Paper text:
The photosynthetic reaction center (RC) of the purple bacterium [name] (recently renamed from Rhodobacter sphaeroides) is a photosensitive membrane pigment-protein complex that serves as a convenient and informative test model for studying the mechanisms of electron transfer, photosynthesis, and pigment-protein interactions. Here we present an approach for stabilization of the photosynthetic reaction center of [name], which is the formation of disulfide bonds between its α-helices.
In two intra-subunit mutant forms A([name])C+L([name])C and A(L37)C+S(L99)C (pairs 3 and 4, respectively), the formation of disulfide bonds did not occur.
Author numbering:
A (entry chain H): 10 to 249
B (entry chain L): 1 to 281
C (entry chain M): 1 to 302
């Protein structure tokens, strides 16, 4: 048993200590584990719950402490399909409208995300002085087609991540002249149309609306995004 | 058990094979058809290693070595104790890996997320298949594959590379290495950058993403962006493994000599032919 | 062709972003630079601005002098021939002093003394750049993780060309300045020391270089799989979990039985990479000093 022997055995004891640190750090959300009725689970594993930590949030938004008491802060319209644990929970209503499965949102902060200086991070381009399409097919004015191949509206604006200068949303003008937002990560921009494989046209109006025309909350974003991604599962009866 | 937010995601749907028949979880582990399959393929392969272990006569993980068939079996088959076990085991592993990426795909469908992950894994599968299938077949024999041993597969890397002088001079080997280093450089900076913003100095509020951009602009003069660093991380890691796969598939089939000889193409070039001076003149 | 967020579809562009001030000495901060439409296909198009104060300038000065010291030695070894210079560019090499010069600094210029002078210049470029990566983070109210993770890489570097040759007793033991020559040295080093594949800190360094590539493929793809919910906005997901983070963790929990948080995958990531050269540094410091033959030693011990 030499210095290199000592060394390597020590590194593996460190290493086990480091994995123990990292797993528990990675338990600051979602823990403790719950039974399928949502009460504390009997068994939690070997790794303990981590000691709380706090983040002081900028712009006076307060403080976050994790792990804190977890609650979904939202009605979950779902129900056990099975007596013993491990099975699907089937949606009791319209999963898309109700926000479950691939349609889930989180009760996020109903405030908009702020940049370093305290202005809204996201703004529709025609509220963002100086912003313009700089390359690739500029999509404003384009008809928006869903997976039923029928048109749902026409693009009126691009909603941009200012600090980072990226298209995030297409604002889309529907049959009644109102608009919804469409994630940029979920559309195909083509020379003559914007195609949205996630939703059929008839569903475009079930996109959750924003309570203001030149900002969007994280709560809103989350509803708007999970619903569009929920169409991959739920509007596939109409995908041909 | 469940994460306190997991319940609303455990919906039926998204299966690719078998409808709802396998749509369930075992503890935290989703099942689905391909977890059935993964289990089958990986269960068989582990038995046959245990077999291949009782023939060798040792139950020590550090000595167990499943060897590929002899060079002299070409691409045929072999008895179970002369390569046949390596051949089936290779088939269960390939089944287990492909199944694993496909089960991941069902999980991407149920959770409604991108298919980026099982596509990135599939590069690891190409790498494996390159060493155990594409390369040995092109060379004409399974025996050119690496054995399933903890230390014997490092001897295989050793023996193989020193067949070409120094495998360092393989120009695709250096591109793969450059990508692997740069991936690690980037994973270190990128985790350090987020942690430096999530956990600022004492007596400070949690920093913002603009604080992340300015750090790197101050530091090197450019911030790739929070979406770009993740594309960069993915591009970096997959490129390493794709050039590994290149560097090996061309070694033995279309290049045979000391890999350093390849670099006579630059030296003997005509516009500095025979000059007196330097290392090579 | 369901779009995959690998390349941008529509680049947009507005006023340059000047960045946070906090406590940065704006006097030492350059103006903002051009916009690369070409780099906008993959990430941010904006180029600059950079900080450049006392530390950065000292760093780039010596860093250049290390580059112009090695280069002029190449220019000499090529007979100052601008064609012999490009021919053998990857074959030229600034070698440390021969062993019997020991750690003496009286080794002549053409026979080791020049290696000592570039190595001084490079020593200063790195450490005052390291000090820069730290102060850049102070000026902005950020934790120091960047400088700490960078001291991990410095560590194996200080080991190769400084710490280990000292403990071996001569400059000859250091790594020559040359493309191919430093690879030859890396091959030689494994043979001299009894196959490095059997140096158990090397076999750890590999697991982490590999695992560093495993983890970023894992993480980079996950964040792109959940960018359709703003998943790359990691701070506010850390601040305030959104379905993006919930969906990221559950893919992995269902897939392999356990999962991270949007903060904690960054701790896995910083450590996975950092450990690459922490272990790599230890295994090299120990070669020739405490362990002569790593293969034989693998038989004595384990
Ligand atoms: C030979 C060695 C030579 C090598 C030379 C270079 C070494 C490489 C340095 C490694 C650092 C990389 C990681 C960076 C990082 O995470 O920084 C966090 C954090 C960021 O710093 P900060 O923002 O300025 O300060 C804010 C707070 O510290 C808090 O900031 P935070 O909350 O964001 O970060 C929390 C962080 C902060 O913690 C620290 O203070 C960092 C700890 C020191 C770092 C060195 C780690 C490597 C040790 C070598 C291994 C030895 C093997 C032999 O927590 C940890 O690091 C916890 C580590 C877990 C310990 C492992 C358990 C082992 C126990 C074994 C028993 C189990 C076995 C049972 C059977 O770093 C530090 O706190 C300082 C680190 C010190 C670096 C070197 C300084 C001089 C020495
Ligand atoms: C004596 C040794 C030779 C040499 C000979 C070779 C040879 C020979 C090869 C390499 C290869 C590699 N070399 Mg070289 N090489 C040398 C020097 C170096 C040096 C150095 C510092 O000097 C470096 C950094 C490298 C770098 C590398 C990479 C380019 C590459 C390894 C990664 C890879 O392929 O992943 C690819 C990834 C995989 C194969 C992993 C696939 C995993 C599968 C899909 C999943 C497995 C799951 C498992 C069964 C699960 C267990 C259970 C769960 C854990 C619960 N070489 C010297 C000169 N090198 C290899 C290569 O390019 O391969 C393509 C290769 O064959
Ligand atoms: C890549 C180019 C070469 C190669 C060259 C090297 C070199 C060189 C080294 C290794 C090292 C390792 N290699 Mg190898 N190796 C290759 C192919 C593989 C394959 C494969 C299916 O293709 C696997 C599973 C492994 C596995 C491993 C481990 C023994 C070890 C650490 C890897 C690691 O952390 O990776 C990153 C992955 C992770 C961090 C995730 C966890 C991975 C776990 C540990 C893999 C477990 C495999 C298990 C022991 C066997 C299967 C169990 C079965 C049920 C029987 N190698 C090819 C042939 N490999 C190192 C070592 O210590 O060797 C002794 C080392 O020095
Ligand atoms: C034939 C060759 C030998 C061998 C000999 C060596 C030797 C010798 C070494 C390694 C080391 C490494 N080996 Mg080995 N290795 C072999 C086989 C392999 C194989 C394989 C598949 O066969 C692989 C994957 C590896 C893998 C690796 C890595 C795990 C490790 C390097 C970490 C790193 O990032 O260093 C690269 C990173 C750095 C060097 C850090 C640099 C930090 C500095 C401060 C940055 C300076 C920048 C400079 C100023 C320039 C700035 C310029 C301006 C920006 C323009 N080895 C065989 C057996 N290997 C190293 C190690 O640690 O071993 C324990 C090492 O030194
Ligand atoms: C987890 C460890 C991994 C890692 C980590 C790591 N490296 C780091 C960091 C971290 C965490 C930093 O914070 C630090 C940094 O600043 O990052 C941006 C860095 C860094 N890692 C670097 C390199 C590097 N890291 C490597 C490896 C790795 N680093 C590991 C894989 C490697 C290799 C061999 O694998 C290299 C080469 C640098 C980019 C940087 C350290 C910079 C430094 O100190 O530089 C001093 C030199 C200068 C300031 C100037 C040099 C000038 C040139 C010599 C001139 C040549 C140019 C020519 C004259 C130009 C002509 C005109 C032009 C307009 C064309
Ligand atoms: C391309 C970039 C990197 C990459 C990516 C990557 N790998 C991945 C993923 C991704 C994105 C996954 O989604 C997937 C995963 O689930 O990760 C946790 C995976 C994964 N990468 C893993 C390992 C791994 N990846 C590696 C490499 C890489 N993975 C690249 C560097 C390496 C090495 C050596 O570099 C290893 C060892 C696993 C943890 C996991 C896949 C787990 C899996 O497939 O499980 C199903 C199979 C089983 C449970 C058991 C199979 C048993 C066999 C039938 C018997 C053994 C056969 C084998 C050939 C023996 C090997 C013996 C050794 C001595 C060689
Ligand atoms: C932002 O997002 C992020 C997260 O989330 C918030 C994440 O978590 C992750 C994922 C990353 C982590 C959790 C960090 C740690 C990960 C690594 C360092 C990579 C190395 C990982 C391993 C070595 C794990 C190996 C375990 C495997 C391969 C699975 C174990 C297999 C079993 C024991 C059973 C497998 C199940 C089967 C057989 C099928 C069905 C089940 C039955 C029992 C039947 C990432 C990337 C991320 O970006
Ligand atoms: C256009 O041409 C001109 C002339 C203008 C050029 O500028 C061209 C220049 C070049 C072509 C140069 C290119 C350089 C290379 C090809 C060399 C590549 C170098 C490497 C790969 C380095 C490999 C590793 C080097 C290491 C490990 C260095 C370690 C450094 C030490 C830790 C520093 C320790 C310092 C010491 C010992 C100094 C001692 C003295 C003191 C006072 C402290
Ligand atoms: C094409 C040539 C092939 C070689 C590959 C060339 C790429 C060079 C990479 C350098 C890594 C250093 C920069 C990457 C690290 C960025 C850190 C980070 O996390 O960035 C977040 C963002 O910038 C703020 O939000
Ligand atoms: C190399 C990767 C393996 C590291 C292991 C990290 C933690 C694994 C166990 C986590 C426990 C999760 N669980 C089941 C308690 O919820
Ligand atoms: C990877 C790209 C390199 C980034 C480095 C950019 C340095 C910024 C300097 C911009 C100069 C501005 N100005 C107008 C004073 O020239
Ligand atoms: C050196 C002066 C820096 C200021 C110049 C600003 C460059 C932006 C020019 C926009 C051009 C876009 N383009 C054509 C490059 O794609
Ligand atoms: C911080 C992440 C922890 C991941 C550690 C992975 C351990 C890989 C085991 C490789 C074994 C090395 N060795 C030399 C003992 O064979
Ligand atoms: C550390 C390298 C290989 C070891 C195997 C990986 C650890 C097991 C990960 C799965 C744990 C899930 N579980 C059962 C705790 O819930
Ligand atoms: Fe990230």
């Amino acid at each position: 048993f030499d210095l290199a022997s000592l060394a390597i055995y020590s590194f593996w004891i460190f290493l086990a200590g480091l994995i123990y640190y990292l797993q528990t750090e990675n338990m600051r959300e979602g823990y403790p584990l719950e039974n399928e009725d949502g009460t504390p689970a009997a068994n939690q594993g070997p790794f303990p719950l981590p000691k709380p930590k706090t983040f002081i949030l900028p712009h006076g938004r307060g403080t976050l402490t994790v792990p804190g008491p977890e609650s979904e802060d939202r009605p979950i319209a779902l129900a056990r399909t099975a007596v013993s644990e491990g099975f699907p929970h089937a949606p009791t209503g319209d999963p898309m409208k109700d926000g479950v499965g691939p349609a889930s949102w989180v009760a996020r902060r109903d405030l908009p995300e702020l940049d370093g200086h305290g202005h809204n991070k996201i703004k529709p381009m025609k509220a963002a002085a100086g912003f313009h399409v700089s390359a690739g097919k500029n999509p404003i004015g384009l008809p928006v087609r869903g997976c039923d191949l029928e048109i749902a509206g026409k693009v009126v604006d691009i909603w941009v991540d200012i600090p980072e200068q990226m298209a995030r949303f297409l604002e889309v003008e529907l049959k009644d002249g109102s608009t919804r937002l469409l994630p940029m990560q979920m559309v195909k921009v083509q020379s003559n149309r914007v195609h949205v494989n996630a939703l059929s046209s008839d569903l475009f109006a079930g996109i959750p609306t924003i309570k203001s025309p030149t900002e969007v909350t994280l709560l809103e974003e989350d509803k708007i995004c999970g619903y569009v991604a929920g169409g991959l599962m739920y509007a596939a009866p109409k995908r041909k | 058990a469940l994460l306190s937010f997991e319940r609303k995601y455990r919906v039926p749907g998204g299966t690719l094979v078998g409808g709802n028949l396998f749509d369930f979880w075992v503890g935290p582990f989703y099942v689905g058809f391909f977890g059935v399959a993964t289990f089958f393929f990986a269960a068989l392969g582990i038995i046959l290693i245990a077999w291949s272990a009782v023939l060798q006569g040792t139950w020590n993980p550090q000595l167990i070595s499943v060897y590929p068939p002899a060079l002299e079996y070409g691409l045929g088959g072999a008895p179970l104790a002369k390569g046949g076990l390596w051949q089936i085991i290779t088939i269960c592993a390939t089944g287990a890996f492909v199944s694993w990426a496909l089960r991941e795909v069902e999980i991407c469908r149920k959770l409604g997320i991108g298919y980026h992950i099982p596509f990135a894994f599939a590069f690891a599968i190409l790498a494996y298949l390159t060493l155990v299938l594409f390369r040995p077949v092109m060379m004409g024999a399974w025996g050119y594959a690496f054995p399933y041993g903890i230390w014997t597969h490092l001897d295989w890397v050793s023996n193989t590379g020193y067949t070409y002088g120094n495998f360092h001079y393989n120009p695709c080997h250096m591109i793969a290495i450059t990508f692997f280093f740069t991936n690690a450089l980037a994973l270190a900076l990128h985790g350090a950058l987020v942690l430096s913003a999530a956990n600022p100095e004492k007596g400070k509020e949690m920093r913002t993403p603009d604080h992340e951009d300015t750090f790197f602009r101050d530091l090197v003069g450019y911030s790739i962006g929070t979406l770009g660093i993740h594309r960069l991380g993915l591009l970096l890691s997959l490129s390493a493994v794709f050039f590994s796969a290149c560097c090996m598939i061309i070694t033995g089939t279309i290049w045979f000599d000391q890999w350093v000889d390849w670099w006579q193409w630059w030296v003997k070039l005509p516009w500095w032919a025979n000059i007196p001076g330097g290392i090579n003149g | 062709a369901e779009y995959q967020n690998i390349f941008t579809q529509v680049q947009v562009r507005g006023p340059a972003d000047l960045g946070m001030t906090e406590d940065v000495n704006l006097a030492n901060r350059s103006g903002v630079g051009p916009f690369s439409t070409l780099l906008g296909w993959f990430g941010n198009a904006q180029l600059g601005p950079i900080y450049l104060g006392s530390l950065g300038v000292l760093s780039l000065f010596s860093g250049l002098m290390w580059f112009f010291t090695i280069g002029i030695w190449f220019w000499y070894q090529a007979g100052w021939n601008p064609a012999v210079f490009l021919r053998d560019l990857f074959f030229f090499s600034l070698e440390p002093p021969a062993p019997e010069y020991g750690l003496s600094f009286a080794a002549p210029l053409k026979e080791g003394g020049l290696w000592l002078i570039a190595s001084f210049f490079m020593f200063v470029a790195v450490w005052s750049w390291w000090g820069r990566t730290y102060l850049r983070a102070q000026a902005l109210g950020m934790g120091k993780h960047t400088a700490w993770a960078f001291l991990s890489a410095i560590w194996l570097w200080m080991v190769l060309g400084f710490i280990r040759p000292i403990l071996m007793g001569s400059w000859s033991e250091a790594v020559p300045y040359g493309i191919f020559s430093h690879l030859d040295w890396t091959n030689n080093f494994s043979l001299v020391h009894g196959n490095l594949f059997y140096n158990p800190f090397h076999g750890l360094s590999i697991a982490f270089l590999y695992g560093s590539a495993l983890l970023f493929a894992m993480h980079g793809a996950t964040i792109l799989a959940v960018s359709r919910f703003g998943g790359e906005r990691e701070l506010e997901q850390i601040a305030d979990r959104g379905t993006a983070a919930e969906r990221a963790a559950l893919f992995w929990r269902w897939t392999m039985g356990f999962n991270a948080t949007m903060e904690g995958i960054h701790r896995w990531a910083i450590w996975m990479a950092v450990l690459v050269t922490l272990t790599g540094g230890i295994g090299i410091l120990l070669s020739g000093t405490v362990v002569d033959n790593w293969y034989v030693w693998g038989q004595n011990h384990g």
